[PDB]
Amino acid sequence: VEYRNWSKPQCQITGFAPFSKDNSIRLSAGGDIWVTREPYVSCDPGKCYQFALGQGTTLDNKHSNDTVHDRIPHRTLLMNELGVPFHLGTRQVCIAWSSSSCHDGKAWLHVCITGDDKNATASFIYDGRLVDSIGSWSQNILRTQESECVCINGTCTVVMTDGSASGRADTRILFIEEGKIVHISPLSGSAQHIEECSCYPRYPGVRCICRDNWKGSNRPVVDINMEDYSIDSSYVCSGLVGDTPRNDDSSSNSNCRNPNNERGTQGVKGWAFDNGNDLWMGRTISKESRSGYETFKVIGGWSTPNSKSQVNRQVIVDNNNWSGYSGIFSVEGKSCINRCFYVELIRGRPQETRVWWTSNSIVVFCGTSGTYGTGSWPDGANINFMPI
Amino acid sequence: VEYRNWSKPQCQITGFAPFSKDNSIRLSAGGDIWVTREPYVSCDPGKCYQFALGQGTTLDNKHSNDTVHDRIPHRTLLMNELGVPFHLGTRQVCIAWSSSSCHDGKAWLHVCITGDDKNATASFIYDGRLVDSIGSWSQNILRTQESECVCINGTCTVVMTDGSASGRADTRILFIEEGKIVHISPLSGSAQHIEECSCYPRYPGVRCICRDNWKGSNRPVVDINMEDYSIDSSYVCSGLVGDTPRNDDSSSNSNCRNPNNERGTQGVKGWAFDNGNDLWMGRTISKESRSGYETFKVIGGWSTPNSKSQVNRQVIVDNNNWSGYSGIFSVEGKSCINRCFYVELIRGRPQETRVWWTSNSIVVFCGTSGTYGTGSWPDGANINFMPI
Amino acid sequence: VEYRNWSKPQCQITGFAPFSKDNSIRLSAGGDIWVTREPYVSCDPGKCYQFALGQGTTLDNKHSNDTVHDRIPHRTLLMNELGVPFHLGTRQVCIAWSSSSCHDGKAWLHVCITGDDKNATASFIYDGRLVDSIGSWSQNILRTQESECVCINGTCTVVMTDGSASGRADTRILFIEEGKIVHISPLSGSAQHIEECSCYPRYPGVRCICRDNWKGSNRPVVDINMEDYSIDSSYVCSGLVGDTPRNDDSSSNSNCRNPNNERGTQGVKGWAFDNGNDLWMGRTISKESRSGYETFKVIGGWSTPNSKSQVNRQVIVDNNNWSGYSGIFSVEGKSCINRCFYVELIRGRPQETRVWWTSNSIVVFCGTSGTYGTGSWPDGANINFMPI
Amino acid sequence: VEYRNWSKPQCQITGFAPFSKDNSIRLSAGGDIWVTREPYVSCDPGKCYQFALGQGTTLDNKHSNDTVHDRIPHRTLLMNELGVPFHLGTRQVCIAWSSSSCHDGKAWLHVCITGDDKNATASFIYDGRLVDSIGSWSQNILRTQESECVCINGTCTVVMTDGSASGRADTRILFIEEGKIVHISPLSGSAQHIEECSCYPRYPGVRCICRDNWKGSNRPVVDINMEDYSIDSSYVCSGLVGDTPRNDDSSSNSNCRNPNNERGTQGVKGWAFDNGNDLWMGRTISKESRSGYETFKVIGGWSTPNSKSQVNRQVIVDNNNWSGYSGIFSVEGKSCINRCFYVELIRGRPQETRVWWTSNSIVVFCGTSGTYGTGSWPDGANINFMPI
Ligand SMILES: *[C@@H]1O[C@H](CO)[C@@H](O[C@@H]2O[C@H](CO)[C@@H](O[C@@H]3O[C@H](CO)[C@@H](O)[C@H](O[C@H]4O[C@H](CO)[C@@H](O)[C@H](O)[C@@H]4O)[C@@H]3O)[C@H](O)[C@H]2NC(C)=O)[C@H](O)[C@H]1NC(C)=O
Ligand SMILES: *[C@@H]1O[C@H](CO)[C@@H](O[C@@H]2O[C@H](CO)[C@@H](O[C@@H]3O[C@H](CO)[C@@H](O)[C@H](O[C@H]4O[C@H](CO)[C@@H](O)[C@H](O)[C@@H]4O)[C@@H]3O)[C@H](O)[C@H]2NC(C)=O)[C@H](O)[C@H]1NC(C)=O
Ligand SMILES: *[C@@H]1O[C@H](CO)[C@@H](O[C@@H]2O[C@H](CO)[C@@H](O[C@@H]3O[C@H](CO)[C@@H](O)[C@H](O[C@H]4O[C@H](CO)[C@@H](O)[C@H](O)[C@@H]4O)[C@@H]3O)[C@H](O)[C@H]2NC(C)=O)[C@H](O)[C@H]1NC(C)=O
Ligand SMILES: *[C@@H]1O[C@H](CO)[C@@H](O[C@@H]2O[C@H](CO)[C@@H](O[C@@H]3O[C@H](CO)[C@@H](O)[C@H](O[C@H]4O[C@H](CO)[C@@H](O)[C@H](O)[C@@H]4O)[C@@H]3O)[C@H](O)[C@H]2NC(C)=O)[C@H](O)[C@H]1NC(C)=O
Ligand SMILES: *[C@@H]1O[C@H](CO)[C@@H](O[C@@H]2O[C@H](CO)[C@@H](O)[C@H](O)[C@H]2NC(C)=O)[C@H](O)[C@H]1NC(C)=O
Ligand SMILES: *[C@@H]1O[C@H](CO)[C@@H](O[C@@H]2O[C@H](CO)[C@@H](O)[C@H](O)[C@H]2NC(C)=O)[C@H](O)[C@H]1NC(C)=O
Ligand SMILES: *[C@@H]1O[C@H](CO)[C@@H](O[C@@H]2O[C@H](CO)[C@@H](O)[C@H](O)[C@H]2NC(C)=O)[C@H](O)[C@H]1NC(C)=O
Ligand SMILES: CO[C@@H]([C@@H]1OC(C(=O)O)=C[C@H](NC(=N)N)[C@H]1NC(C)=O)[C@H](O)CO
Ligand SMILES: CO[C@@H]([C@@H]1OC(C(=O)O)=C[C@H](NC(=N)N)[C@H]1NC(C)=O)[C@H](O)CO
Ligand SMILES: CO[C@@H]([C@@H]1OC(C(=O)O)=C[C@H](NC(=N)N)[C@H]1NC(C)=O)[C@H](O)CO
Ligand SMILES: CO[C@@H]([C@@H]1OC(C(=O)O)=C[C@H](NC(=N)N)[C@H]1NC(C)=O)[C@H](O)CO
Ligand SMILES: *[C@@H]1O[C@H](CO)[C@@H](O)[C@H](O)[C@H]1NC(C)=O
Ligand SMILES: [Ca+2]
Ligand SMILES: [Ca+2]
Ligand SMILES: [Ca+2]
Ligand SMILES: [Ca+2]
């Protein structure tokens, strides 16, 4: 087996087609299913896997109470084949309240963070064994992507942040070979706050669209040079911005370089990718809450500041339904690299108070060069039918 | 591994022998089992798999209420080794309220349809990745076989329909290579309505026996030429007709060419196959409801219009028990290709109203050249023992 | 992979050592576990599997009521790796209320009998496909070994009986190559009634120790010549007889040739094997009921009529606990063939009437050339703790 | 596949990083999970597995009552991939109330002890078959490591004891090749009582840190020469002793040679390993009970009698939480052999009497040459939420 290089052109897509749905919450009402959040998808050269951070409990279980909280020692990284719900036979791959995983063509890398808020540990597990670890450098919630890392020619890269959630933080980009950290680069460029990067291979480098939790409702961009380890960063050009919260479309802005200072505080993990001058992106339908999910192409959204002409919109989850995090993953085809995305469908607290837990299901779409119709694929559970 | 060509003669059979039974509904009364309908079977070169469309819920689960409905966003294609019940570790292969699957000798193809009735999307997944998609062409419930597609020399074919369920519709035959649609041929010939084809390899081509939901209780036949993509169609000759509803045997007719206009509206998915001038077929025992199931050979049933001489009858499910959809699948043996079939055993609504759900189990038989006895192999659940 | 020839000498054993226990009934009180009976064990060249006839239901399930009955259409052959309890993910390999399975070194053969008492069907499934079938020849409960068949050089043999349970019956020995019946030999010799043979390879032939349900509490022997298909039969010489019911040790007899007419009617499946002039055998401890289980070597038990000197006794299940069927299986070692056995531990009806079901667990022992101690390994469930 | 030689240098470590956690008890409150104790971890050349002794029952099950007891016939060795909780699909590998397992590079060896206290049997299972067995030599609870054995060049060694738990006993070191005992060496050296050895490869030999249940709160050391089968033994030099119970640090002693006679009776399974003159070790935080868990390096802890200079302490489980047994396992990396350890987290009786059962979960850490922070990773179940 050979290392992945991702050295094919990006598939020319017309939009996205339905790929997977796990129905986790509906099933939790009649079966033993893990409580999770922060899911993502990543594929080895043959097949795709779904990941999520468990809460060390199933849903119909008194331990599900108060699982809205982000970090406990019992959170572990769950990994199943895509479409297999997180049942009790699910393997816990490592201890983690923040994680990233990727396959370099030969084996899986998992980056797993756990421990005290002020002094966390990131473990690097490769081909089923612990190879390296690093401790918190800013003593303030060391944290990473919550989606797939990217490997080119045996070197994988992952973005990690330590420091304030609402101010200048310390972001670093790690380069990892067979689980061993070989280089660490500081963030450089004009992005002012970076969290939860959704990264994809863009040979010969890697590109990430992230979350600015401080001053921007426009999404930061991080560009990683795999050859000399140099880093650059900026903001997505599109005037149709990707974060939540954000201003409405008529009053949102981005200049490609700075956070827009428009309802910039807080945010949600999301994604986007460039195609020439244009941009494919997803976002919540609601500008204030994690409700609904839509994708579209912005004409000039990559190259033209404040561009707002969109086309090829698709509703993924209608605005009467809860969404959550979303992220990108890439899949190598015969002659091109396709882009896919997942969206987290969060149920329970804080939005739905009949129950005491917080969990999620997922829905997954992949780029297509063919044609498609319309629909909406929400979580689908009836909150009144759930164990509280 | 090589592409399948199915280039062996058809096995000479004397009837069918018991092969598999999953007992899904009996088990659902004491375990967490998926609610499903529209099951089918298909084998890779090594082993057989059972498929079905989940309802995004288990049976003992409040979400099982009102699962009689055909199309919701939460339906997904389930896939297990044949004989493994749909428990919570079952993989959901794609999002689908209509589907077909087949293995070309190298990898699995799944065709999965979901979304809005008037604007559905068909996804084509090959070797674990989304390769193509197509949108609705008549804006009226794009739909496909609900049984295995057939591949010869790396080209797979699947029959799809869009348009009226009770009038002229738009049926097309897709040719697919490694997940990519390479050609689409319109239906041609004298079949006037085509749904839910049960197809089998008949080298060098493919033959399908389908459901006419409009004017015929005789089953349409679709012949597919894999070399030039040409299509022909007609109706099964046998005067013992295969649809439900239908006239009783003394007053049923087929002329091989036209729908018989005998209780033609509505129908059920079924199968038949030719052996020279003769026909092997199955059908429900009841002529008006999906109750019981029988198989038999009709002498001259392939070649002689209105032939009604049967022999080698076998009861599969006695008429005091519910059946449902049925379909064919083919299995390559050492020197010949065998024909097998499955029967969907529907329990719950609308026929049994003590419970609020609709689900099924399955029973499976394979052609034999040996001898056999008699029996009946129904679902076997006691409706009074079930969670409602 | 090559066909098995079993052409190594038999292991010299000093007794048996603990190998496996599944604890099915204890687990059934807190988990979804199949109701089964008539288990057995068989190994491919790499690993062992446990088999049993399911009753189409789990134990904590209203359908478990009245599972004391032997034959219903919902019984299927279950197959797991040895030591994996029959949970809901268990594969049902075929439809069967009587079965036998074996691996020829290349693939599995399953012989599965189901259908009407007076007209049953045996299906032969090889390498995952139905290859042959045969119908009842005496119209009276066609039935087979309920333990492993034996294959030498690609030809597998299995013993089947059709006819009276309490009088002359029609026993036949089938020879099967890759699932295809190639020859059928009538029983010959002096055994007067043959059921439920426990067979083992004894190169160049196969030897079976069976159950006489008519006139003998001494066990019949069937010898199968794999080269010319000839059959011989007689009775185990040992004066310590293996069936239940039977006379006490002081008044039991066997002459090697005829049924002993000592509490001969009824019986239980059991096993024995020869070592030179001596005999290793197991049996219930109770002479009248399926209670307890013991193994020992009878000096001259193979060659000397009415021999009663035993040595190397081991209690497997003490007499205060229920047992049931037992059978032999053989395992190829580096330089010899080992013999192992399982015993079925029956719980519920008819002996324990607090509950309405009948099920079993298993315990498994293997021949050893080493040393060992003592113990008792019964089912271990508390009938008062069970769902009724 | 080749035999393991473990012929690489030991990894230089700075401490330990989080590796795995199974959350067994939390999950048991909402799912069917095995009752277990005496867990351990061992890896084949590709991946790691978790083992434990089941109690033949799930936790939410009336049979979980009184599972504090050490030895019943229903205990079996469970084996899952590391991180997969012991659900109902878990394989029971053999019958055992004491065990050890290891992989020699080609196949798994399991050593399984069961039966009567005064006459137990040890079974040796290699590559899925029973190869050897040995009976009790002192008629007083034959028992072994409860952690991984170690194989070099096709010879596996395991430490077994028979005799008094509180006085002179009979300890022997077995040498095993493909499951067959080829040599047995008596314990030699100055260790006066040996139980539950935690062994690791230290090419060309094997080293074990054990439990003295009689006179020492310092841990015995056993050195095994794999070339001539010679044995040596002594006690860990460190004045910071590893057993529980023990004296406080100010008044604890070890002279490297004799048991210290400081709260020597009783004990708990634990581990340590050498790095030059220094010692890495773990122990409960409490000196009297199985509460808390800490690791640290003792400068001169291997070579300097009574050394008490520690550095690089890490809390693994804070002292407000229950621990239990702990043990070492070794993982071969690209250029070195790493050392890892697991901690058993015991819940229920005798410490927590709200419930009537005794079970455990596990947490697992691996050596790292990188950096790390702080935390505590206890079982995490709320005893008040548990089925009693
Ligand atoms: C059947 O399905 C197809 C495919 O999904 C669908 O065609 C699509 O329709 C949408 C909506 O009209 C198109 O996307 C739009 O493109 C225009 C530019 O041409 C944009 O202006 C639109 O954005 C505005 O309107 C949106 C609401 O529709 C707002 O949310 C947004 O803020 C803007 O105000 C939007 O991007 C899309 O291009 C086509 N896709 C293709 C491939 O043609 C079709 O309509 C469906 N038919 C029915 C009747 O369901
Ligand atoms: C033991 O099992 C065997 C094998 O299943 C069984 O033999 C079969 O019997 C049936 C019924 O007699 C045969 O099928 C019939 O064939 C005749 C032509 O020879 C047809 O006329 C029959 O059709 C008419 O009758 C049917 C009801 O039986 C009606 O439903 C139908 O509409 C027609 O009116 C029917 O097809 C079959 O050929 C044999 N099979 C073989 C291989 O011989 C046997 O009877 C069983 N024995 C017992 C006592 O159970
Ligand atoms: C520790 O375990 C060992 C191994 O299990 C055990 O040694 C065995 O003891 C039994 C019982 O004494 C021996 O089997 C006996 O052999 C004699 C002939 O030498 C027979 O006469 C015995 O049969 C008679 O007695 C039986 C009851 O014991 C009756 O059931 C039977 O009907 C006969 O009347 C019996 O076969 C066996 O040979 C040894 N095994 C070996 C290898 O030595 C030992 O006793 C155990 N120690 C203790 C004290 O538990
Ligand atoms: C963030 O995490 C890091 C890494 O875990 C942590 O650094 C570690 O701190 C501990 C505690 O200070 C160090 O271990 C100590 O080393 C000294 C020798 O230098 C020993 O004397 C200590 O033992 C004494 O004190 C213990 C209590 O701390 C007693 O239990 C013991 O009996 C002795 O009296 C102890 O071994 C360790 O070396 C460092 N690790 C590294 C690699 O630097 C750091 O403190 C954390 N920061 C915060 C604010 O949480
Ligand atoms: C399944 O859902 C149905 C429909 O919601 C439930 O029956 C309804 O109950 C409401 C309120 O009690 C009535 O007003 C409706 O008339 C009922 N609908 C029908 C068509 O009868 C039913 O209770 C649910 N079943 C279960 C087991 O919860
Ligand atoms: C198992 O089934 C039997 C038979 O139905 C049940 O026993 C019967 O219960 C019915 C219904 O109340 C009574 O009318 C009969 O008198 C009973 N028959 C006998 C033979 O006593 C039994 O209750 C069922 N067991 C369980 C646990 O449901
Ligand atoms: C677990 O088993 C114990 C022992 O049988 C049960 O406690 C006993 O209950 C009996 C009957 O009331 C008393 O007479 C004994 O004194 C109790 N034993 C002890 C040690 O207290 C207990 O009820 C069982 N637990 C559960 C949850 O069923
Ligand atoms: C603390 O909040 C951060 C993360 O935010 C959220 C959320 O749903 O918004 C979920 C995460 N949950 C987990 N990954 N477990 C957080 N991240 C962490 C490390 O808590 C945020 O990005 C600010 O730094
Ligand atoms: C709408 O009815 C169609 C299908 O019919 C039925 C039925 O049990 O008859 C089940 C399917 N259920 C699913 N495949 N989910 C339907 N087909 C669809 C696509 O709904 C029919 O063939 C007429 O067009
Ligand atoms: C009818 O009884 C026969 C079989 O006996 C028994 C038993 O526990 O004794 C279990 C079987 N149960 C199943 N195998 N299912 C039977 N065999 C059959 C075919 O019923 C007996 O050997 C006489 O013929
Ligand atoms: C009897 O106690 C021994 C073992 O003790 C412990 C314990 O938690 O301390 C658990 C074991 N439980 C199991 N291994 N099942 C015991 N060992 C046995 C064989 O009982 C001890 O080391 C003294 O000899
Ligand atoms: C869940 O925990 C909360 C907070 O501690 C408490 O207020 C509430 O009563 C609990 N709810 C349930 C369902 O037990
Ligand atoms: Ca923001
Ligand atoms: Ca019709
Ligand atoms: Ca008898
Ligand atoms: Ca001690």
Numbering used by the authors:
A (entry chain B), B (entry chain C), C (entry chain D), D (entry chain A): 82 to 469
Paper text:
NA, which is a sialidase, catalyzes hydrolysis of terminally linked sialic acid and functions as the receptor-destroying element of influenza A and B viruses. Additionally, influenza A NA is further classified into two groups: group 1 (N1, N4, N5 and N8) and group 2 (N2, N3, N6, N7 and N9), based upon primary sequence. Group 1 NAs contain a 150-cavity (formed by amino acids 147–151 of the 150-loop) in their active site, whereas group 2 NAs lack this cavity. NA inhibition assays were carried out and complex crystal structures were solved for laninamivir, laninamivir octanoate, zanamivir and oseltamivir in order to elucidate the structural basis of their inhibition.
